[PDB]
Structure formats: C-alpha cells, structure tokens
Amino acid sequence: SDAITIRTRKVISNPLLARKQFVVDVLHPNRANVSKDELREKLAEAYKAEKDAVSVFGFRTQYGGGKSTGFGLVYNSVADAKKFEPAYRLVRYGLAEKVEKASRQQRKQRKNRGKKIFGTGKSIAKKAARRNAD
Amino acid sequence: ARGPKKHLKRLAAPHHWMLDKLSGCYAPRPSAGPHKLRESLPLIVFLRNRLKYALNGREVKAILMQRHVKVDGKVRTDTTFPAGFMDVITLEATNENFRLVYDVKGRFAVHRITDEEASYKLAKVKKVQLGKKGIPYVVTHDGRTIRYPDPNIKVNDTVKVDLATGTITDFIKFDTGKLVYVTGGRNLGRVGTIVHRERHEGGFDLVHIKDSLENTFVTRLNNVFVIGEPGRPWISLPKGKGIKLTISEERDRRRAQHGL
Amino acid sequence: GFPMKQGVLLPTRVKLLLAKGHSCYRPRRNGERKRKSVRGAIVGPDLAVLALIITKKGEQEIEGITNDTVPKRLGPKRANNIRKFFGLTKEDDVRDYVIRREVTKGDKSYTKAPKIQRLVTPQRLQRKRQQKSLKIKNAQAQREAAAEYAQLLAKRLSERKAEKAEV
Amino acid sequence: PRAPRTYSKTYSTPKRPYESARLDAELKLAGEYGLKNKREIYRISFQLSKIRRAARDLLTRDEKDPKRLFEGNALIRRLVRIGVLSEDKKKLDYVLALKVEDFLERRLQTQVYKLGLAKSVHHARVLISQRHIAVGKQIVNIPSFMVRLESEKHIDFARTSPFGGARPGRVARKRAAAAGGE
RNA sequence: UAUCUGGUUGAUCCUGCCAGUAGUCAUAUGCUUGUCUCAAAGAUUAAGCCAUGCAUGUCUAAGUAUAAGCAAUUUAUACAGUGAAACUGCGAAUGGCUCAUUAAAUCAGUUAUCGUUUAUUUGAUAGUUCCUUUACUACAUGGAUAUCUGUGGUAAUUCUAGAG
RNA sequence: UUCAUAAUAACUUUUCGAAUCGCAUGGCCUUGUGCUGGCGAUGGUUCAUUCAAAUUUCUGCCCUAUCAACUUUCGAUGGUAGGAUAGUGGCCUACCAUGGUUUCAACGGGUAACGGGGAAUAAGGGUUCGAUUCCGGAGAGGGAGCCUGAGAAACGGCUACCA
Ligand SMILES: [Mg+2]
Ligand SMILES: [Mg+2]
Ligand SMILES: [Mg+2]
Ligand SMILES: [Mg+2]
Ligand SMILES: [Mg+2]
Ligand SMILES: [Mg+2]
Ligand SMILES: [Mg+2]
Ligand SMILES: [Mg+2]
Ligand SMILES: [Mg+2]
Ligand SMILES: [Mg+2]
Ligand SMILES: [Mg+2]
Ligand SMILES: [Mg+2]
Ligand SMILES: [Mg+2]
Ligand SMILES: [Mg+2]
Ligand SMILES: [Mg+2]
Ligand SMILES: [Mg+2]
Ligand SMILES: [Mg+2]
Ligand SMILES: [Mg+2]
Ligand SMILES: [Mg+2]
Ligand SMILES: [Mg+2]
Ligand SMILES: [Mg+2]
Secondary structure: OOOOOEEEEEEEEEOOOOEEEEEEEEEOOOOOOOOHHHHHHHHHHHHOOOHHHEEEEEEEEOOOOOEEEEEEEEEOOHHHHHHHOOHHHHHHHOOOOOOOOOOHHHHHHHHHHHHOOOOOOHHHHHHHHHHHHO | OOOOOOOOEOOOOOHHHOOOOOOOOEOOOOOOOOOOHHHOOEHHHHHHHHHOOOOOHHHHHHHHHOOOEEEOOEOOOOOOOEOOOOOEEEEOOOOOEEEOEEOOOOOEEOOEEOHHHHOOEEEEEEEEEEOHHHOEEEEEOOOOEEEOOOOOOOOOOEEEEOOOOOOEEEEEOOOOOOEEEEOOOOOOOOEEOOOEEOOOOOOOOEEEEOOOOOOOEEEEHHHEEEEEEOOEEOOOOOOOOOOOOOHHHHHHHHHHOOOO | OOOEOOOOOOOOOEEEEEOOOOOOOOOOOOOOOEEEEEEOOOOOOOOOOOOOOOOOOOOOOOOOOOOOOOOOOOOOOEHHHHHHHHOOOOOOOOHHHOOOEEEEOOOOEEEEOOOOEOOOOHHHHHHHHHHHHHHHHHHHHHHHHHHHHHHHHHHHHHHHOOOOOOO | OOOOOOOOOOOOOOOOOOOHHHHHHHHHHHHHHOOOOHHHHHHHHHHHHHHHHHHHHHHHOOOOOHHHHHHHHHHHHHHHHHOOOOHHHOOOOHHHHOOOHHHHOOOHHHHHHHOOOOOOHHHHHHHHHOOOOEOOOOEOOOOOOOOOOOOOOOOEOOOOOOOOOOOOOOHHHHHHHHHHOO
16 A cells, blocks of 8 residues: 545635645555655545646654654746746755856955956956956 | 944844744844834835745845835835735735734734725824925824825824825824733734823823723823724724633634644 | 146146046046146156147148048037037938948848937827826815815805804 | 853752652653653753742742743643643643652653554563654654654654554664575 | 751760752753754854945836847837836845943833924825016926046046046 | 014025826817816925934943042033023033032953843742844944035945055
8 A cells, every 4th residue: 555645724815915824744555655646646636626737845753753744835827936936945845947156255256356347347457458468 | 343233144134024043144124114123124124024925035126126025005125025914915916905904912013905995004293293385284193295185184093094195094092991912012013092181291091992892901102003992993903803812712712723 | 747737837737626526536436635746737857658649731742641541430419519520400301311321230230210319209208298187286286275275164164154153 | 152052951959868768669660651860851851840949939929920821821731732741720720739650751762662563561661762763653762752642643653664564674684684685 | 838967075965167968041060961842052252354245226107218238019200018227216224143331321101392393104185486567488498417438647546537 | 481473673695386298088169279277296394293312300231349539731520701502501612610420339450241022940048141033232453533414424425545
C-alpha cells in the first residue's frame, strides 16, 4: 500500500488574491516524504484547476513518519498565479525563470563606483585618453 | 532625539494588535492618520493577523494596490493606515463589510456587518467651535471636522455621520440613562448605561456605568462613547454584547457549550 | 589645477567658503559649504591656462575656428521660444516648425521631435474650464449651506421666544 | 535587538550534598524506575515543589474566595488528568501530600513496563529510546513523557519497526540475506 | 520548599570569627565532550587607534527626455514604447551602535501648554486677485541653467573652469 | 481668559488666491469644431487631527561631615521694562530691591554611577546587581560654531582649533 491520503483542511476562499488557501495534511504510510510536484499534481486533479495554478509550500513530517503537514494555495487562473505568487516559488515550480544577478557585494561596489562620477562618463573616458597620451 | 520616530519595535507595539512575540523584530507602525497610534489598528494587522486573507506584508501590499480595501467609503493604499474605533472596512470582492469595534476582553474584534449599517459611521464629539468667517464646526473624536452642525450638539455627544457624503444625519445627547461603550482602560470593550456623572471641575470627570447584569464600574469621561438609548444601540454590538464575564464564568461557558 | 574665480582680484591663490550659487563648487548636499582654495581674477606668471572669448574678428584666420561652424544641437522646446526663433507671431501654429532629427539604425529610417512644452492643448483648456467650474460650484454649495444654517437659527430663535412668554 | 527567548532551569540540586540517607533513597528510586541520573529525580522534585508552592498559596487565601476556587481547581484538574491524584482526592489539601513516587509511576517508562511490552524497566526504557512504542499513532522517543491517563489506554508498539509488525530491519534482515544464497 | 557542620580546651559551656555547604541569563579559566532543541557573545581594560569592502538612497498612466540609448513595429510628422544621465521633488533627523559624561541632572509614575512649534496625515476650506466700466497676453508670460556637444587645467579627490 | 469668533483703524520693502500633470472621450446642437463635462495625480490657505516638540507640576536617587555654611564683582533670589525665542521664563540687557538654599544635611567630594522596566538570591522581612534585546537619555577623538530643513547645534553634513 502507498495510499497517499491527501487532505485540504482550514479552507479560506480568497477572491482578493483570486485563490483558495488551505492547510495540506497528507498521509504517507510506509512511504517517506511525498515530493512537492506529486502533491501539486494531486491537488490539481482534486480541484480541476491547472497544475501550474497550484502552489504548495512549508512542509514538515510528523516525527516518526506517517504524516506531512504543509500549506497550499490554488489560484483561479495560471495568469493569476503568475501575478500574485512570489518569484522564487514560481521559479521552483518551473513557470518563471531565474534572474541572473551578480553577488550583492559586487553590485554594491558597482553602485559605489557609479557614485564617484557625475553624468555618463564618455567625456571622462576621452579626458583619460588624451590626457594619458600627453 | 532629532525629529519624529519612524520605526516600531515588536515589543513596544500596542498589545491588542495580538502580535506574536517572535517572527520579527519590528511591528507595523501606524502612519499619521485619523486615529491615535495606540488606539488605532493598522490595515496590515487587520488583513494578515485577523482575517488571514494575506500571509505576509507583500501580499497585503498587493491586496491594497488593486484598490479593493475601503476604510469609511474612501479607498486607502497604506499598509500602515490606522483604522480605529467605529471605522468601516469594506472589501469589494467577498462583499463583506466590517466595523472595527472592541470586544469584552480588549482587542479589536472581527465584526461582520450588513450594507445597511456599513453606509454610516458613528462618532464622538471632541470639540465644538466657531471657525473662520464665524462658521461653526464640530470635531469628531475619530478624525473629522463637520461644518454647520445642529447647534445643540455639544462635546461628548455622539453623531451619526452618513459617511457617503460626511454629513450629520442624527445624534445622541450625552446624558444619564443612555447606552454607552467604553473605549479605553481596563473597562475597554464594555457596554453600559450611565448611572451617574461625577464632575470634579479641574481634572477628569468620572462616569458611573452599570451593564445589563447590574454590575457597576467607573471610568474617565474621555474613555466613554455613547451608543444609543438603553437596550437599543444605534450599531450592532459584537457577540457577547460587551458584557465581561468573570474568569470562572467564562470557563464554565467554555465547558457547557462544548461541541467538537 | 585651481580655477580662477571672478571677483577675487589678487595675483595669488586664496581659501574661500563656497556655497550654492557661486562657481568653483558643486554642492553634494543641500546647503553644503566647502572651504576650497581658488586662484584670483588677476593673471600672473603662474597660470597654466587662459580662457579667451574672441569678440572681434580680424584680418587673418585661425584654421578651424573663424572659417568653421559647429551646428546648434537642440532646437527650442517652449512654444513661445519656437515662435521667437522663427519669428512667426501668435496666430500661426507651432507644431509645423518643430525641428526634426533623423536617426537610422542601419535599415529603419526614424525621426525625433521634441514635446512642445507650454503648448495650448484642448486638454489643457478642458482642465482650466473644469477648474473654473469647480470652485464656483463649491462656492454655491457653501452659500446654500450658510443659508440653511441661517434658516435653522431663525426657526430655533422663534421656538425659544415662544416659551419666553409664560407667567 | 530581536525579542529575547525565555529559558527556565527545570531542576534544583539539594542544599546539602552528601546527606547519606538521602543519597541512598535517591539511588533506590533510580533503581526502581531505571533513571539515568539523579538529575531526573531532582527535576521531579522541583516539579513537585512548584505544585506545592501553588497549593500552599491557595490554602493561605480564604476558602470559597475566587482565586483559590479557580486556580486551585485548575491545578487539581491537571493533576487528575496526569493521573497523579486519585478521584478520591480532588481536594487541594491532598495536593500537598503527593510525594515524588506518584510522578515517577506515571512516566512513559513505568507505564510501558506495567502494561506488558517490556520485562523490566530498563528494557522498556531501551524500547522507548529505540523508537518502538507509540501513543496515539505517534512514536514517542521520550522515557519521561508523563502519560495523560486517557492516553494510557493507547500505549502500543509502532506501525513502523518490528514488534508491532513491519519489516524486521538491520540484524534480522542481514541474517535473512545470509540465509538466502546459501 | 524557615536545616547548619569542622576549628580557641586535658575536658566544659559560651562569645566570636575563620573554614566548609548551596545558588548566580556571573565572568574567567582547567580538563574532558556523542546527539536534539534554544542560543548569549570586544560591556568590564583603552568613549584607545584604525588597513580594506560595505552600511541611504529613491520614478509612477500621472513634475522635466531630441541619450546622436535600446527599440522595431502595422497612434505620432509636437510629443506618446521602454529608458542611462541630469534637473526638480522627497528622504538621508529613522534605524544601528555605545554608556564617556551625568547624583535633583537623567529617569519613573504623575500633571500642565489659558505657554508654544509641528513636513507628513486625515478631515476642512478661498465667486471679491480688477480698481472706473467705448477697443484688453490669458486659446496660456519671461529669462536662465543642468545633463548633453565640444575646449581644457591638475601628481592627485566623488576638484570643475571656458564655449555652445 | 484680553478664548473662539466677529467688527471699526490703518499698515505691509503685500503672503496666499492652480499659467501643473495622467487616463477617460461622455452630453446639447445656436452644425461651430462650438459650448461643454468624468475619474484621478501633484500642489496651495487657515483651522483640524495625527505622528511628533520643546518646556513643565508633584513625589522618589548610591556612599561621604577626615565637606557646615553655600550662592550674590562675571545673575545669585525677586520686581519693572525691553531684547531675544516657536513660545514661558535672569534666558539675556538696563534700572531697583536683598534675597534664595541649609543639621528634615544645603554646598563640596567620590562613584571601578547612564535612569527605569527588570536580574540573582528566595520562609517573612531583606541583600546585591542592572554596559546589555523594551522604554527614556546622552555621544560619534576632543571642544566650539553653523548651513540645509517640518525636524539636526547632525558628524557615514560643513567650518575652525587641539590631539
Ligand atoms: Mg483642562
Ligand atoms: Mg507641461
Ligand atoms: Mg524507524
Ligand atoms: Mg534568614
Ligand atoms: Mg583561650
Ligand atoms: Mg587540643
Ligand atoms: Mg564562607
Ligand atoms: Mg539524527
Ligand atoms: Mg571598548
Ligand atoms: Mg536629487
Ligand atoms: Mg536613534
Ligand atoms: Mg484674540
Ligand atoms: Mg518679560
Ligand atoms: Mg560612567
Ligand atoms: Mg545603577
Ligand atoms: Mg541600563
Ligand atoms: Mg563601563
Ligand atoms: Mg574611537
Ligand atoms: Mg557634532
Ligand atoms: Mg562612521
Ligand atoms: Mg548617524
């Protein structure tokens, strides 16, 4: 037996964010940890809404296995999900993609450097050139 | 030290925010608004920590932005907007209307209300004066100034503001044997009748209040907010009709009304 | 390095407290007042550079300064300015005489034109009209309110002077 | 500058270290209930003392006085729930007469022993530590768990582990494997 | 959670201390140290001195784009998509750290402002700017200056001169 | 209350009373492109209020008499008028008066003193600690002085001197 008895407890219907929010309580028996993707799929099947319009986060195993408790939101449309859900979560899901920043330190340094010049530094470049030459 | 303070530490917050000790160092400081900092209730708190429609500050902000929350008809977009006593919070989606009233214990209660009551706001009178060009104005203890008031409206009198325009529709004179609500101190959240009004012309008038169960108590005049004529309030009061049980009584109630 | 400040006189460099308004300084905070060293208004044997503005043209030429012209980069932006530049008068319309710039990516031929500021739009006119209306309306409302109040006062005074009779 | 976390020292050492009789008593107690430390005993004593303090205070107040009626009553209820006080003695005056044995005879240790499942206290302790024994389908690791009287009916082996019927695991499994291809 | 015990004598009863005993969100330190949760941490001496990096910046349909920026494509022949810079606005007086000063000072509870200032906020709110009333800018006034383009100064700095 | 407020007198190097932006593109024909009109942003006057602010009342601080008199030319205590300030006030200035505090410790000295919430101990009473997560207050090497601003005598602002 694998079972995976999924439950949506504490269901708040939320029109203000176009979602349904609930505590996900899932049963394991003999199987360790449900995996998020699978859970999402299950939720989608339950609720008829698209798999990408489902979001599940913040899970903990009961201690001694058997159960997992977490938090789940099901948005009305995929568009809705896109425009209300945090970016990291979206990335995790597979919808939105990773933003490619440098390490924050580098950014800070860059900013500081920028501070040190007044205006766009094309004139400055020219000055450096010509002055360097003679 | 140097100008106004702009942060609020989590412990220094009003206790009736019901804010948890952990999960953060800071509390949402109410912005400059209609209600006093300590007597207010920021929109964020209302949204996240009461109704649970938002999970975090970002969510709350998002909710605010799509122009959906309405404090006293007017829109609002501040996360830290200080909605206080008698303020009507209307959500366009859900079609729920709320009035911010206290409960038996002290904190702000989630009090669901119909559209027929949500149209008006009830407000105490703080000041009555002639303004510029000799024009009389009334000041509500809840923010407003209303020009050309009915000239037998005095201080401490409560006023039915129609909210949609902001005009006085009707009023209650402050007098003995009139239904009252307590808005400050230990007795805050309690409903009563006004048995007697002590004066002490110099510092702080004390009003004696009896509730429905014949149980007298005394509070300062500026903590006392008229609500109607006894038995017949102008607004709907929250569950437990501002009554205050003893602890034992409360326990008994909890026990005897078990239905798990 | 040090610049020449106009007004100092003196054939030597001097320290000055410099604020917003006067040169030899760009303030980085509002009301910042750096004490900076600056060279005088008198030319000596110690200067590296003189800055010379040639006002009267002469007999001979200097290669690329008297013979040659640099085009003015930006046409006027204000409508009145535009009018002035061309010499057009008030009834002639500004839109048509706006200086165009031709930009090409390599294939796409494209034109740039300034937003004429202080131009008589219909929108502007409408706004003005609305403003005019609004104040008037407010005034009317106020008057009405005052009248009502007066009436109320009258019909309370009367009431008072009905119980002013008695024994 | 985050809000401070509350600690509380949950035991108290004796005010005189080598009181020989006392020491022997402690040892005896340990022997009885398979206690790893004197520390456990001390903890229990501390707990008892706290209760006593409350009870004494309550007594000091007038009887039928609100506070006594409430808090004392609550305490009594708690005690009954835990199973330390008996139904004969819901009194508050009897709360003072409790003594350390009644708390130790209520641990998930002793309870486990006294329902079968064990053969001596040490064995029971081992089982508890070893993640055998569940209460309400919840595997309890803690030897000093304080069984809540109504939950005492439910003490059983886990659905995981052997003993309560699952995969044998580790040593048995190894043995089986060895047997297999020979 | 009301407790004492060893030491003045050949022995005794005291006064008395010293010594032990227990605790310390009390520091140090000596040995050891498997796990879980929680987590103080350059205060004490020197409010002694500081390499280097970072810690306050900010733009929406909605103050100002002719970047000679990117767009590029089926709202522009005034602009109108994004948008670096710069002007303007606002913020930088909050936060964070530390305890040197300080003994009616600070501070705590308590009053008072009929003794004042207060960006912001949420309410309010201004037909009267005219100046004699037969031909008047109001279908909208003026001159700048930033970025930018060019000419430089200095060993150098978030130094700025000269012109357009 | 000489308050709110109103009124007469005038004054003023006459403050403010929208030459500002975005999206809407609706209603009457006197058929102009006419007159109009919606939802908003920023602004701006005084009064509110709110976040604040300066002061301010009464009562309460640890050791010390091997500190008993202290303050008052250079303001000490009070008066009058002015100046100054956001405003009250010796806050400062002029003229005048001689007060003010103190064995119920003034004043001075010390603190290895920031104050409080609190902490350790724990029959009852106490004793010791509180640089430190919250609330006040100070300070940015030391002392001054200011600019900008609603708000700073600011130091990740400036000006000087000393180190
Ligand atoms: Mg009063
Ligand atoms: Mg414009
Ligand atoms: Mg296992
Ligand atoms: Mg004692
Ligand atoms: Mg002797
Ligand atoms: Mg001897
Ligand atoms: Mg000792
Ligand atoms: Mg493990
Ligand atoms: Mg140090
Ligand atoms: Mg700027
Ligand atoms: Mg600070
Ligand atoms: Mg007056
Ligand atoms: Mg005076
Ligand atoms: Mg000190
Ligand atoms: Mg101290
Ligand atoms: Mg302290
Ligand atoms: Mg120190
Ligand atoms: Mg230093
Ligand atoms: Mg300074
Ligand atoms: Mg620094
Ligand atoms: Mg600072």
